[PDB]
């Protein structure tokens, strides 16, 4: 399509020349919440439909956490064509995050490095914002367009588990699923909440809080992990997740590694790297987690997805759903239709009836 080329070759490179990445991000959020977005032409095929996490998803392509941190653009994102939307991370109290600049483009690598540090409007602001459209969301969810809420912790917080517990109580009733983000590279000490006995403590408390919500307001609970885990970390996570009955895994967050071959001038900036250089590390982590959980724990695959083939590789590796964030900053909105359309053509070619049949297919052949 000419739409896709025009955004990739002209529109998005123009935006890059005009604005720094954080301004571009804020402008995008503003324009999305106003509904100012091109054609919704591609009507979703039945092949793209997935049933997982106690819900129907019209299509398996979601927007990853971080684009809509404060829940301002949910409806614009469904209009863009995403089959589900995740907001956050949201922290209990408002906070500024790190000083600017904090986000950096690596156009040669199709990569971004960010160190936002959980800038959040806080639970209360986000709660009221989601309450204003709650019934609208209940009809979207019923129509196969679910909402996820990603939870983080405040910087100065003494008690990590309590920050997540507050998030469960406040935003849990408003979410189809919740994400315990234990994998941000940009809050000190946060990533070691991924070691055994302390991860069992934390998730036990989270699941207890969740179980104490009323039935129609009781969301699925997922854990979001980094691509930088040791084999030991991964084995411990799989074990805790099976023992406790966690509903699923999001795989993966951004990486603190800098793979050999990055060209961008800004490659040595502190922060998490996303986009194309993260793609295969993330696919390999999906593959490992799926095998370690015996295919019993639904996985949302994320990291460098920018085409139907990328999405299909994650699905075949064991993802039931996928997300993207960085691709959108290089291709703009038409990237959503592109990934859906290529994913559907590839499923026909490899002889799958729908997305469901492809899930984990690499582990059976
Ligand atoms: C206004 C309008 N009028 C017509 Cl007629 S079509 C159209 C349009 O293209 N709308 C539109 C609206 C919202 C986002 C968008 O595309 C995006 C999506 C994401 C980003 N984000 C970034 O560029 C970006 C960067 N760099 C980031 O998000 C940084 C933080 C990672 C920018 C534009 C495009
Ligand atoms: C600017 C930016 C902000 C992000 N913020 C968050 C966040 O708040 N919480 C979270 O769990 N992930 C966050 N992520 C990670 C994305 O959700 C996704 O896991 C990661 O970027 C890999 O996907 P991608 O390569 O498609 O961008 C962020 C990523 C970027 C680029
Ligand atoms: O806010 C951030 O810095 C952030 C959080 C997160 O989970 N992942 C990421 O790349 N950045």
UniProtKB/Swiss-Prot annotation:
The identification of DHODH defects as the cause of postaxial acrofacial dysostosis (POADS) was obtained via exome sequencing, demonstrating that this method is a powerful tool for identifying genes underlying rare Mendelian disorders. Exome sequencing consists of targeted resequencing of all protein-coding subsequences, which requires around 5% as much sequencing as a whole human genome. GO terms for biological process: 'de novo' pyrimidine nucleobase biosynthetic process; 'de novo' UMP biosynthetic process; pyrimidine ribonucleotide biosynthetic process; UDP biosynthetic process. It comes from Homo sapiens. This is Dihydroorotate dehydrogenase (quinone), mitochondrial. It catalyses: (S)-dihydroorotate + a quinone = orotate + a quinol. Catalyzes the conversion of dihydroorotate to orotate with quinone as electron acceptor. Required for UMP biosynthesis via de novo pathway. Belongs to the dihydroorotate dehydrogenase family. Type 2 subfamily. Its cofactor is FMN. It is found in: Mitochondrion inner membrane. PROSITE patterns: DHODEHASE_1, DHODEHASE_2. Binds 1 FMN per subunit. One of its GO terms (molecular function) is dihydroorotate dehydrogenase (quinone) activity. It is an enzyme of class 1 (oxidoreductase). InterPro entries: Aldolase_TIM (IPR013785), DHO_dehydrogenase (IPR050074), Dihydroorotate_DH_2 (IPR005719), Dihydroorotate_DH_cat (IPR005720), Dihydroorotate_DH_CS (IPR001295). Its EC number is 1.3.5.2. GO terms for cellular component: cytosol; mitochondrial inner membrane; mitochondrion; nucleoplasm. Keywords: Disease variant, Flavoprotein, FMN, Membrane, Mitochondrion, Mitochondrion inner membrane, Oxidoreductase, Pyrimidine biosynthesis, Transit peptide, Transmembrane, Transmembrane helix. PANTHER family: DIHYDROOROTATE DEHYDROGENASE (QUINONE), MITOCHONDRIAL, DIHYDROOROTATE DEHYDROGENASE (QUINONE), MITOCHONDRIAL-RELATED. The gene is DHODH. CDD domains: DHOD_2_like.
């Amino acid at each position: 399509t000419g739409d896709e080329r025009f955004y990739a070759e002209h529109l998005m490179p123009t935006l890059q020349g005009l604005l720094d990445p954080e301004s571009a991000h804020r402008l995008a959020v503003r324009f999305t919440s106003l509904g100012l977005l091109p054609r919704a032409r591609f009507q979703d095929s039945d092949m793209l439909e997935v049933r997982v996490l106690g819900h129907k998803f019209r299509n398996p392509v979601g927007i990853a956490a971080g684009f809509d941190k404060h829940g301002e653009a949910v409806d614009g994102l469904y209009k863009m064509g995403f089959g589900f939307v995740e907001i956050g991370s949201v922290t209990p109290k408002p906070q500024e995050g790190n000083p600017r600049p904090r986000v950096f483009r690596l156009p040669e690598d199709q990569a971004v490095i960010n160190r936002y540090g959980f800038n959040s409007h806080g639970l209360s602001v986000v709660e009221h914002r989601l309450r204003a459209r709650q019934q609208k969301q209940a009809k979207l969810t019923e129509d196969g367009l679910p909402l996820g809420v990603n939870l983080g912790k405040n910087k100065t917080s003494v008690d990590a588990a309590e920050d997540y517990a507050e998030g469960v109580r406040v935003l849990g009733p408003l979410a189809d699923y919740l994400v315990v983000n234990v994998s941000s590279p940009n809050t000190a000490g946060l990533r070691s909440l991924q070691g055994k006995a302390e991860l069992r403590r934390l998730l036990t408390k989270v699941l207890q809080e969740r179980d104490g919500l009323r039935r129609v307001h009781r969301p699925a609970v997922l854990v979001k992990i980094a691509p930088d885990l040791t084999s030991q970390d991964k084995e411990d996570i799989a074990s805790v997740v099976k023992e406790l009955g966690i509903d699923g895994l999001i795989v993966t967050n951004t990486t603190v590694s800098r793979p050999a071959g990055l060209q961008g001038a800004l490659r040595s900036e502190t922060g998490g790297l996303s986009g194309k250089p993260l793609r295969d590390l993330s696919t390999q982590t999906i593959r490992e987690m799926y095998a370690l959980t015996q295919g019993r724990v639904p996985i949302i695959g994320v990291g460098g997805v920018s085409s139907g083939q990328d999405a299909l590789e994650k699905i075949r590796a064991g993802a039931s759903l996928v997300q993207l964030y960085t691709a959108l900053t290089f291709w703009g909105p038409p990237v959503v239709g592109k990934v859906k359309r290529e994913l559907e053509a590839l499923l026909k070619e490899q002889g799958f009836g729908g997305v469901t049949d492809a899930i984990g297919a690499d582990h059976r052949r």
